[PDB]
Chains A and B, each alone.
With several copies, the nearest count.
Chain A
Amino acid sequence: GRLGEQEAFAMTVPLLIDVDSSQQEALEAIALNDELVRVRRALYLDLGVPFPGIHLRFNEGMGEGEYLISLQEVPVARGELAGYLLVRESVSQLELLGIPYEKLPDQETFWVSVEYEERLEKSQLEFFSHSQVLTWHLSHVLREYAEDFIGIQETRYLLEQMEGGYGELIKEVQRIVPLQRMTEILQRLVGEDISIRNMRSILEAMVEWGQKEKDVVQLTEYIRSSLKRYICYKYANGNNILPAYLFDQEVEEKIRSRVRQTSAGSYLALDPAVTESLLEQVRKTIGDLSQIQSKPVLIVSMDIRRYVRKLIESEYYGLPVLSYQELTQQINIQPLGRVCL
């Protein structure tokens, strides 16, 4: 107010959700304050990333069903949820034509009225309500942008919360590696959908391998390999069965030939034409199988594992990449196909 006060500085909110008005009290009292904490708690228990507080505001400037999720006051997921009285369906197909009713970062979405809800729930299909679709978008945003929630402050909070539990372990790991390297390792772990939750084994691996390796890539590969049984349970389906798309030795050597560890980055730039040919070979062998299940994983030599992942992250964001060291024993690895050259 005063024209002598300097600026009245205020920090930007980390996470904001702006939804349209006319749902301030039309939506209130139906979850929206327990569902959000429920989904955040579930995602944290699955991952371990200390997500921040969520600010919810009702803005009348926009339309009637526009919701936007913004991280640090920059919108990252917008959408107009249709939505007012039409609940969405994610497995809409010619089956939805078989039951004839009127019909986004989610899967195939089609909207149906609430009068159709009874007969369609007799068929037991998806009935995402407003809370369900909002929390689904929130969960997707948190999962794909969790790296932005792992700062120095967050890692320090995690260490301080476990001081009573493992004091000497924390004191040793702090003297072995700094906060910056540890936080970068945690971010790289979360970027591969590896849960931070089991911090004890992570700290033990950090202690064991931080004295030997100083490069971040090799250290995080060792920490990944320290989670053999967790990775095995997370990716293998059925009993001791792990689907694999193992790489040929020639392709691995060709990829490894251009590690380029010049400026502590180690970017994998071989040739645009050569990488195009390798990606074409991977596409021809693996195939697409997007509609199919069981989450097959690519298994390659450890020293280049991450370098392979970002090579195929553009097209096959699903397919994980694993190291031979990361595999525990008593596993029947079934090779779905070798990526030839």
Chain B
Amino acid sequence: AQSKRSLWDFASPHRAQDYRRELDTLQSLLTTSQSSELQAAAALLKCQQDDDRLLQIILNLLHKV
């Protein structure tokens, strides 16, 4: 309801090709660190890094003409 929307508004805080190698830099930064929290973050980032590698390969194989 309205209260749930207020919860989401409380949680609420560039675009398009801003998504670049910033992810890769952060993943390699956190890979060095020995903190367990940063290690979990790095593994999550690697997961998304490879799901993105799979979707880029699928888009390259399909494309359009």
Contact = CB atoms under 8 A, between A and B. Distances in A.
Direct contact of A and B (CB under 8 A): yes
Nearest to A330: B16
B58 A324 contact: yes
B60 A275 contact: yes
Nearest to A266: B65
Given A267-B65, A272-B57, A332-B16, A95 B3 contact: yes
B8 interface: yes
Interface residues of B, number: 24
A267 B3 contact: no
Contact of A240 (B3, B14, B51): B14
A229 to B, nearest CB: 15
A267 B51 contact: no
Interface stretch (A62-70, A206-214, A333-341): A333-341
Contacts of B58: 246, 301, 324
A38 interface: no
Interface in A142-197: none
B54 A269 contact: no
A335 B55 CA distance: 9
Interface size class of A (residues with CB under 8 A): 20 to 34
Contacts of B3: 91, 95, 125
Contacts of B33: none
B52 interface: yes
A147 B57 CA distance: 27
A305 to B, nearest CB: 11
Contacts of A131: none
Given A90-B1, A335-B55, A325 B62 contact: yes
A6 interface: no
Nearest to B51: A335
B19 A293 contact: no
Interface of B: 1-4, 8, 14-16, 19, 48, 51-52, 54-65
Interface of A: 90-91, 95, 124-126, 217, 239-241, 244, 246, 265-269, 272, 275-276, 293, 301, 306-307, 310, 324-325, 330, 332-335, 337-338
